């Protein structure tokens, strides 16, 4: 299938990124949502560009997510994956788990449904990369510089249907646009 | 013994007769060995005496609010240089402020008389690493003696607190409030064990007493502003003492000395 069109005005890192997460990671469905027209800036940055991808399995997601963080680290962007466990962060969780089993005697192994070692959603927040001056009326110090924020949300098929963050931010968009028209009028 | 491992009479002066040039091992103690194991830490340049004037924030362009303390230099002169051949170590004596001639004694009036300096308010020594740190006597040090971004250490006498208890002095927890306690809320509790612990209070035991009014050093404090006309040197963070007290400011011992160019420009 084709690739998600790049919204006009995106940074120069947006075109390689989409190609990377598609031609090198192997995400089934990719949809880039343009949410840079929200009156109140959301609690992620001025102008978000949520990119949604689907992973084959939790293990594939954990590798792809960590593979993307290292791909963006070679360009200067320091992304923080919300859901990607660290090397030693996993050791301690395994140590405690195995340690308790030793004492108990393997009486909780079949009862460890939720351990914190597995996740089906990872949110790679790249942050607000390109900052620039706005144009406002202040007679105030200056203009409140804004910038585009990039957020890559990689999750599994099962987890991408429960959350349904595509219709959440889509509904938020149209709502903030209608309210904008009220002030202007037309 | 009285102090340490030495049983030598305090009135005996044998230092000059045990020389390394005669084939003796360089002693591990003494002024020579004390300077050698402090060579790296010792500051290259002298310090300045400043007066704590208050606390504020340094608002920076684009959004930075940095809490800072203001220290003012009030006629800081160089009064005397302490060489190693005469005193046993390298240091510079710095003076601050002024004092009325009537209040200055004759022993000190004749001391400034031999230098051409007006009587100062206070005097303090700043240890330097080698002979390159000694400055001409009678030169004034301005806030530009430092540069913005230079970390320094500020030594000042802490606020006096009189006779403190166990809670305020040593951070003792105290005892309960209402569950049957009997006249013992802020008291220190036990002071020791019993016959198996010496039937005595052990030296170094923490007890109530006087707190404060002692020297305290805050290390690694950057220099945010340097204003010559005002005479102030704004440092980050807090500094020991009250407003109007004199403090000692010098380069940080735990940080590399300023670049060679700066140490030479200030001397130039």
């Amino acid at each position: 299938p084709p690739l998600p069109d790049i919204p006009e005005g995106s940074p120069k890192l947006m075109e390689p990124l989409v190609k990377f997460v598609s031609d090198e990671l192997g995400m089934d469905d990719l949809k880039l949502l343009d949410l840079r027209e929200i009156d109140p800036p959301p609690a992620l940055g001025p102008e978000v560009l949520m990119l949604f991808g689907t992973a084959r399995s939790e293990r594939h997601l954990h590798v792809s997510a960590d593979r993307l963080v290292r791909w963006l680290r070679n360009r200067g962007v320091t992304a923080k994956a919300d859901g990607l466990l660290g090397r030693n962060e996993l050791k301690t969780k395994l140590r405690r788990k195995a340690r308790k089993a030793k004492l108990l005697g393997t009486t909780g192994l079949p009862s460890g449904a939720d351990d914190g070692i597995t996740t089906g959603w990872i949110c790679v927040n790249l942050g607000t990369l390109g900052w620039s001056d706005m144009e406002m009326e202040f007679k105030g110090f200056g203009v409140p510089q804004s910038g585009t924020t990039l957020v890559v949300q990689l999750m599994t098929e099962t987890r991408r249907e429960e959350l349904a963050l595509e219709k959440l931010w889509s509904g938020i968009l149209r709502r903030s646009l209608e309210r904008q028209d009220k002030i202007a009028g037309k | 013994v009285k102090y340490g491992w030495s049983t030598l009479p305090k009135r005996s002066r044998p230092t000059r007769f045990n020389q390394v040039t005669q084939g003796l091992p360089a002693p591990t103690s003494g002024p020579a060995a004390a300077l050698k194991r402090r060579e790296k830490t010792t500051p290259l340049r002298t310090g300045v005496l400043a007066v704590k004037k208050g606390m504020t924030v340094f608002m920076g362009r684009t959004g930075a609010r940095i809490p800072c303390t203001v220290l003012q230099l009030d006629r800081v002169q160089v009064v005397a240089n302490k060489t190693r051949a005469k005193n046993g170590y390298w240091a510079v004596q710095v003076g601050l402020g002024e004092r009325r001639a009537e209040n200055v004694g004759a022993p000190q009036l004749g001391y400034y008389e031999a230098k051409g300096i007006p009587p100062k308010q206070t005097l303090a020594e700043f240890k330097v690493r080698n002979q390159d740190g000694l400055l001409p006597v009678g030169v004034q040090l301005f806030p530009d003696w430092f540069h913005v971004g230079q970390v320094v250490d500020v030594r000042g006498i802490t606020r006096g607190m009189g006779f403190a208890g166990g809670m305020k002095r040593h951070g003792f927890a105290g005892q309960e409030a209402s569950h049957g306690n009997s006249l013992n809320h802020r008291t220190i509790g036990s002071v020791g064990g019993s016959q198996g612990s010496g039937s005595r209070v052990l030296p170094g035991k923490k007890m109530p007493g006087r707190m404060g009014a002692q020297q305290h050093t805050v290390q690694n404090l950057p220099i945010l502003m340097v204003d010559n006309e005002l005479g102030i040197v704004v440092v980050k963070g807090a500094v020991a003492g009250h407003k109007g007290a004199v403090v000692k400011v010098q380069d940080a011992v735990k940080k590399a000395p300023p670049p060679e160019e700066f140490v030479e420009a200030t001397k130039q």
């Binding site: 406002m136 110090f141 200056g142 002030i183 | 608002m59």
Partner: protein, 105 residues
């Protein structure tokens, strides 16, 4: 007289993003370079207050979007935290203000 008084409604625009926070001024602490102002607003159904340093660079601008009819008889208006005197949400005055600018401009 023309300055912003306690009890008025202000609007602080933030440098990084432009996110404006509107609220009714409850207090003004004059402390040299750290002078601050307290704005109360109901975001959602939650009452949220905000201290702002007027001499910081993270505040792009402050504007008076609605003045108090009569001068307040108190230096501080901490009584506006109680449901009795709570002004509630300030979105009404913000919407009515933006309209003026757009129509005029």
């Amino acid at each position: 007289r023309h300055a912003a008084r306690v009890g008025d409604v202000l609007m602080v625009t933030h440098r990084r993003g432009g996110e404006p926070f509107a609220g009714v001024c409850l207090a003004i602490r004059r402390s040299g370079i750290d002078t601050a102002i307290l704005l109360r607003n109901h975001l959602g159904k939650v009452g949220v207050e905000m201290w702002y340093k007027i001499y910081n660079k993270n505040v792009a601008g402050i504007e008076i979007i609605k003045r108090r009819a009569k001068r307040a008889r108190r230096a501080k208006l901490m009584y506006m935290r109680q449901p009795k005197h709570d002004m509630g949400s300030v979105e009404q005055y913000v919407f009515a203000w933006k309209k003026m600018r757009k129509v005029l401009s």
